[PDB]
Amino acid sequence: VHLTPEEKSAVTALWGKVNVDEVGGEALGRLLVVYPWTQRFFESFGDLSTPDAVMGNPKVKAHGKKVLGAFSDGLAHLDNLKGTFATLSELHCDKLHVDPENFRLLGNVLVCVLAHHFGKEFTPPVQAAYQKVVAGVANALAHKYH
Amino acid sequence: VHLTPEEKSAVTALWGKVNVDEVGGEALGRLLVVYPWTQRFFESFGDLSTPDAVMGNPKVKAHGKKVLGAFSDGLAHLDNLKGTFATLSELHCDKLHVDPENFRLLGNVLVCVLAHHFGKEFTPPVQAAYQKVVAGVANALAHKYH
Amino acid sequence: VLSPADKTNVKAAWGKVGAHAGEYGAEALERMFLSFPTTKTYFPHFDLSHGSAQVKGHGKKVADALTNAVAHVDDMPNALSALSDLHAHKLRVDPVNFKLLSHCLLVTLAAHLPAEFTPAVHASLDKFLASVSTVLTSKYR
Amino acid sequence: VLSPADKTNVKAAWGKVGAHAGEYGAEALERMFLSFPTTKTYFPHFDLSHGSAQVKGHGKKVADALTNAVAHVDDMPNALSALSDLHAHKLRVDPVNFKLLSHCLLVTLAAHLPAEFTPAVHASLDKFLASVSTVLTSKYR
Numbered sequence: 063v064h065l066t067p068e069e070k071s072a073v074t075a076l077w078g079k080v081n082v083d084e085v086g087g088e089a090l091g092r093l094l095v096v097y098p099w100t101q102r103f104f105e106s107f108g109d110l111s112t113p114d115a116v117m118g119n120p121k122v123k124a125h126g127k128k129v130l131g132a133f134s135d136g137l138a139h140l141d142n143l144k145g146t147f148a149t150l151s152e153l154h155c156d157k158l159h160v161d162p163e164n165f166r167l168l169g170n171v172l173v174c175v176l177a178h179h180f181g182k183e184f185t186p187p188v189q190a191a192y193q194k195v196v197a198g199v200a201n202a203l204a205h206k207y208h
Numbered sequence: 209v210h211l212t213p214e215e216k217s218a219v220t221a222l223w224g225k226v227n228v229d230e231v232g233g234e235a236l237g238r239l240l241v242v243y244p245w246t247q248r249f250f251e252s253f254g255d256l257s258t259p260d261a262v263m264g265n266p267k268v269k270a271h272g273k274k275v276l277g278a279f280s281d282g283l284a285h286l287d288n289l290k291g292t293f294a295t296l297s298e299l300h301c302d303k304l305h306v307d308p309e310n311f312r313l314l315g316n317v318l319v320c321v322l323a324h325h326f327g328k329e330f331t332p333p334v335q336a337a338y339q340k341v342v343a344g345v346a347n348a349l350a351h352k353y354h
Numbered sequence: 355v356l357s358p359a360d361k362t363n364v365k366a367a368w369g370k371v372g373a374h375a376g377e378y379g380a381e382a383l384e385r386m387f388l389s390f391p392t393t394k395t396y397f398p399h400f401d402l403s404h405g406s407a408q409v410k411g412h413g414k415k416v417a418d419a420l421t422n423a424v425a426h427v428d429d430m431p432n433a434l435s436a437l438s439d440l441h442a443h444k445l446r447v448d449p450v451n452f453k454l455l456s457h458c459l460l461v462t463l464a465a466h467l468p469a470e471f472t473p474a475v476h477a478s479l480d481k482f483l484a485s486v487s488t489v490l491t492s493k494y495r
Numbered sequence: 496v497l498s499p500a501d502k503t504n505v506k507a508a509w510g511k512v513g514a515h516a517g518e519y520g521a522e523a524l525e526r527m528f529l530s531f532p533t534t535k536t537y538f539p540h541f542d543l544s545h546g547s548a549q550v551k552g553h554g555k556k557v558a559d560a561l562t563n564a565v566a567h568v569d570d571m572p573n574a575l576s577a578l579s580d581l582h583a584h585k586l587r588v589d590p591v592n593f594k595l596l597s598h599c600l601l602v603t604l605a606a607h608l609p610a611e612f613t614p615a616v617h618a619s620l621d622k623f624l625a626s627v628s629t630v631l632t633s634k635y636r
């Protein structure tokens with residue numbers, strides 16, 4: 063991991079335009095819809111019975127805000143994602159037992175959401191930059207497995 | 209990552225009975241036969257035309273002995289796989305571009321090879337122990353990737 | 355897909371599991387729980403202890419779902435529509451798990467049938483368990 | 496195979512792609528080459544620079560093939576037979592790379608179909624590309 067100075071500027075700039083109340087919700091819900099087995103981890107959130115119930119489930123939407131909160135934090139600390147996410151790693155690996163491949167999936171669906179909302183501004187170089195971020199985040203989260 | 213002293217002495221006990229000039233070639237030749245895309249990484253090794261060509265290939269057996277050894281060095285100091293493998297990780301990732309999922313496959317193919325040879329002696333607990341060694345090795349090799 | 359040789363090879367080797375299907379089926383499961391303890395959370399009501407009867411029992415079932423997959427190879431997706439609704443839809447088994455049990459099945463077979471577990475046969479078995487797994491994680495129902 | 500609703504979604508998204516499929520193909524190759532540099536080693540004799548003629552020409556080939564798979568969604572294994580020998584047997588593309596291109600295709604589709612790239616469509620497109628990927632990485636003599 064390591065974003066060049068322009069990738070870091072670009073990622074920070076695009077992020078200031080992100081709706082913080084929704085992006086996380088959309089990405090989390092899309093993960094549950096696109097990769098159904100991830101639903102098992104959120105059984106206590108209520109209605110997940112159909113794709114539309116997932117996308118409309120409000121506990122999923124609100125948990126998404128926290129998921130986004132974490133990406134924002136990893137973002138503000140790009141050169142120390144391991145320690146930024148250490149407690150989170152502990153939780154996800156030791157207590158929740160989420161297979162790490164899912165960390166990649168979520169980063170990747172968050173990337174699709176960004177592309178979806180920003181369209182053409184989500185350029186190939188900006189994508190490549192967010193791909194380093196999302197990979198960094200998934201790697202730190204999986205640390206307690208290593 | 210952390211083997212119990214009981215598992216530790218278990219791996220060590222079984223490894224000491226491993227034919228060093230042969231198990232490596234076995235594991236490598238089998239990785240190429242079972243996941244053929246791996247062959248692309250060793251096309252310079254000559255005849256890989258069929259399963260038998262691959263298993264009897266001499267550049268494949270020699271390299272296999274090199275792979276067994278690195279494994280032996282990990283096993284020799286399970287506490288610092290990262291260290292032992294730092295340069296190895298560099299080479300496989302920066303110079304050879306080996307997707308890390310393959311490290312997991314070679315590890316598991318090695319496990320199958322051990323089972324094939326020690327028969328009933330490769331019991332579930334011994335296997336459990338080897339799975340940690342093999343996982344830790346795959347992780348220390350994928351390190352330069354993050 | 356399962357080329358003639360893969361099919362010929364799997365049928366060749368599985369038709370050797372014999373009366374041992376439930377034995378090996380249970381051992382593979384034990385191998386999986388012990389090596390990747392995360393797999394045990396999918397069986398919260400089972401006694402997963404060493405020689406448990408529930409594991410021996412469930413071992414048999416796994417063994418038979420495989421035999422029927424063999425003798426149904428050109429149409430496994432059908433001789434298993436029900437197991438997929440069970441594992442994917444209902445139980446939500448994260449796909450990585452099928453790779454762990456498939457690996458444990460290979461191990462149980464290598465540990466028991468050395469001369470059958472040849473590189474080419476190892477290859478065809480793996481391609482089979484992979485296809486079975488693909489189906490068990492399927493969507494079409 | 497795809498559910499009847501998956502087929503309806505793929506045809507809806509891809510129909511909207513329309514005449515632009517080749518352009519989107521080139522864009523997705525570009526996104527893949529920049530995001531995952533390792534993918535470039537599969538094209539050593541290619542000029543992969545921004546806007547290169549060879550990438551656009553390769554984008555067209557990928558887009559045209561995908562449009563054919565769409566029109567043969569129930570028999571891709573036959574409609575794509577020649578691409579599997581090519582990617583699996585001759586080029587030996589590591590399976591991991593299909594998820595990168597697939598992901599980059601989704602990403603390209605998202606940045607271009609503001610309205611149709613809904614959660615449901617996105618799931619459908621994903622399964623379709625995984626199905627296409629599945630065929631290209633198979634190898635049955």
Ligand code: HEM
Nearest residue numbers: 100103104128129132133158160164165166168169200203
């Ligand atoms: C890859 C980026 C990810 C980040 C940044 C992240 C972040 C968060 C945050 C900040 C929490 C809050 C603490 C809590 O609710 O206990 C958390 C909880 C949780 N996460 Fe994630 N997570 C990620 C991926 C995953 C994945 C892929 C899954 C599931 C397949 C998942 C499953 C959970 C679950 C089950 C909890 C819920 C705890 C509850 O029930 O309240 N997370 N995550």
Ligand code: HEM
Nearest residue numbers: 246249250274275278279304306310311314315345346349
């Ligand atoms: C995870 C365990 C692995 C171990 C222990 C391991 C160990 C080694 C060692 C000791 C070397 C020789 C370096 C030298 O002598 O300077 C090496 C080279 C190499 N490894 Fe691995 N390796 C592993 C997995 C992989 C995988 C999975 C692939 C490919 C799928 C691979 C491909 C290569 C290549 C191509 C070279 C040989 C280059 C050449 O001489 O032409 N390695 N490895």
Ligand code: HEM
Nearest residue numbers: 393396397415416419420437441445447451452455456486
């Ligand atoms: C080759 C792979 C697999 C095969 C052939 C297989 C086969 C079966 C069969 C035949 C049943 C019993 C169905 C019945 O009688 O109603 C079953 C149930 C089940 N399987 Fe699998 N299975 C496979 C993989 C897995 C994996 C990877 C897991 C999780 C690690 C798993 C979790 C379960 C669970 C939790 C049940 C329900 C058990 C209960 O509560 O009674 N299976 N499977």
Ligand code: HEM
Nearest residue numbers: 534537538556557560561581582586588592593596597627
């Ligand atoms: C959605 C998936 C894909 C589709 C539908 C696809 C389609 C195509 C088509 C139509 C061709 C031309 C075949 C011919 O010239 O007769 C091609 C060539 C090629 N593809 Fe793919 N492809 C896919 C995935 C991949 C992946 C993941 C890689 C590596 C990252 C890859 C590497 C290549 C290479 C190296 C060539 C040959 C280029 C040359 O040297 O001329 N493809 N592909």
